[PDB]
């Protein structure tokens with residue numbers, strides 16, 4: 032059947048890392064920016080640390096550990112992996128710090144300076160991350176611009192395997208109707224995610240109640256063509272929102288298409304002004320040292 036999962040789960044003693052600031056608090060919990068110093072090594076690694084807000088329930092610890100399980104089992108340049116856990120009364124997850132936050136906020140905040148080259152590269156990178164998950168027989172279930180993190184403006188990675196094996200406006204039709212989720216189901220979400228980026232962060236089907244969404248899609252309605260998108264790009268989004276799940280593109284195909292478009296980006300996205308667009312600190316991606 033499946034091959035054994037020999038990923039290592041690293042345990043971090045609370046004294047090897049320090050919380051420095053809060054980055055955000057929500058339903059998810061509290062996320063801090065911090066610094067990790069592996070014991071006896073002259074390295075400081077920028078990290079983010081996640082604590083579950085204001086509780087110590089047995090159900091809450093179960094889901095945190097499920098998340099850690101999935102994050103420990105991946106290794107790809109466009110996916111977020113776990114650095115370790117800290118076994119504190121409140122169990123903490125430690126991962127690499129992604130300084131620019133999520134891609135959704137980044138596109139919103141930084142829109143007047145985002146060119147076609149960045150947009151299409153993000154699309155490739157996400158498709159690469161997703162393709163890697165598919166290789167791992169892993170269905171995401173919550174792909175969205177809010178779940179892509181930004182290491183640098185040139186380098187993004189997929190995250191939030193909380194649901195990874197509701198966010199209704201990102202879901203394939205078959206998922207809404209029948210709670211079915213597949214890799215092809217993730218493509219639909221990929222399509223919505225691309226639309227988000229191309230609209231610089233608009234909310235899809237804005238001011239429409241989620242109950243209505245199933246009905247709209249059944250008729251044949253889809254998200255509108257964004258103003259910067261040539262028909263070439265929008266057609267790709269539309270193919271991801273095809274009713275027959277097998278008619279949708281494969282992640283591997285999307286890597287290819289978007290990648291071709293990234294070679295001549297101004298031919299596929301039309302954006303006004305597009306032309307005019309600590310001594311021992313080591314990034315987690317360069318720190319491959321065991322135990």
Ligand SMILES: */C=C/C(=O)N1CCC[C@@H](n2nc(-c3cn(C)c4ccccc34)c3c(N)ncnc32)C1
Nearest residue numbers: 054055062079080081124126127128129133177191
């Ligand atoms: C758009 C997402 C957003 O608004 N966030 C709120 C601000 C903090 C953001 N954030 N989350 C993580 C993150 C995600 N996951 C799965 C983990 C797991 C362990 C520790 C952090 C963390 C962030 C990271 N790594 N860096 C910077 N911001 C992060 C989410």
